[PDB]
Ligand binder design. Structure first.
Ligand code: HEM
Length: 154
C-alpha cells in the first residue's frame, strides 16, 4: 500500500500539533490504551503495578516512555513510507524481546486516533483521520511482514 502526498500532509499537519506537547499526548494515548485493553499492561513489568488512572498520570516513568514511543513513531511517519531502517530494530525488539502481538499494535493505533480526535478536532476531520489510519495500517503491515522474517508474527 502507498499513501498519497496529500494524505501524508494531513498526517504530518496534525502530528505537528502533537509535537507541541509530546509528553502530554503520550500520557493520554498510553492511558487510553491501558484502560481500554488492560491486558496490554501485562507486557510492562515496570507498569504492571499501576492500579488506577491517577497512578498512571502521576507516573514519571510512564510519561517518559510515552515520549519515547511518540518520538519513535514520529520519526517513522516523517519518513513518509521510507521507514525500513527505522523498522528493523523496532520489530526485532518487539517480536523477540517484548513479544507484542499485532493485535496490540491495532489497539494503540486505536488509542492514537481517539486522542487526536479529542484534542485536535479542527485538524482531525474525516479526511485527516482516514489518512492517519492508512499511515498506521501501513506501519502495522510492514511490522507484521518483519515479524514473519524474524520468526514471530504475533
Ligand atoms: C505503535 C508504536 C509503538 C512504538 C513506535 C513503540 C516503540 C517503543 C520504543 C522506541 C521502545 C524503546 C526500546 C525498545 O525497542 O524496546 C519500546 C519499548 C517497549 N515497548 Fe513499544 N512501541 C509501540 C507499541 C508497543 C505495544 C503495543 C506494546 C505493548 C502492549 C509495546 C511494548 C513495549 C515494551 C514492553 C517495551 C519495553 C519497556 C521497558 O523499557 O521495560 N510497544 N517501544
Amino acid at each position: 500500500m502507498v499513501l498519497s502526498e496529500g494524505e501524508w500532509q494531513l498526517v504530518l499537519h496534525v502530528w505537528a500539533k502533537v509535537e507541541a506537547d509530546v509528553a502530554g499526548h503520550g500520557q493520554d494515548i498510553l492511558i487510553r490504551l491501558f484502560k481500554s485493553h488492560p491486558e496490554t499492561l501485562e507486557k510492562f513489568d515496570r507498569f504492571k503495578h499501576l492500579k488506577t488512572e491517577a497512578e498512571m498520570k502521576a507516573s514519571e516513568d510512564l510519561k517518559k516512555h510515552g515520549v519515547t514511543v511518540l518520538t519513535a513513531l514520529g520519526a517513522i511517519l516523517k519518513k513518509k513510507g521510507h521507514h525500513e531502517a527505522e523498522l528493523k530494530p523496532l520489530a526485532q525488539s518487539h517480536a523477540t524481546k517484548h513479544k507484542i502481538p499485532i493485535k496490540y499494535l491495532e489497539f494503540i493505533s486505536e488509542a492514537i486516533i481517539h486522542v487526536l480526535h479529542s484534542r485536535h478536532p479542527g485538524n482531525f476531520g474525516a479526511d485527516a483521520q482516514g489518512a492517519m489510519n492508512k499511515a498506521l495500517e501501513l506501519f502495522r503491515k510492514d511490522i507484521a511482514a518483519k515479524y514473519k522474517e524474524l520468526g514471530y508474527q504475533g
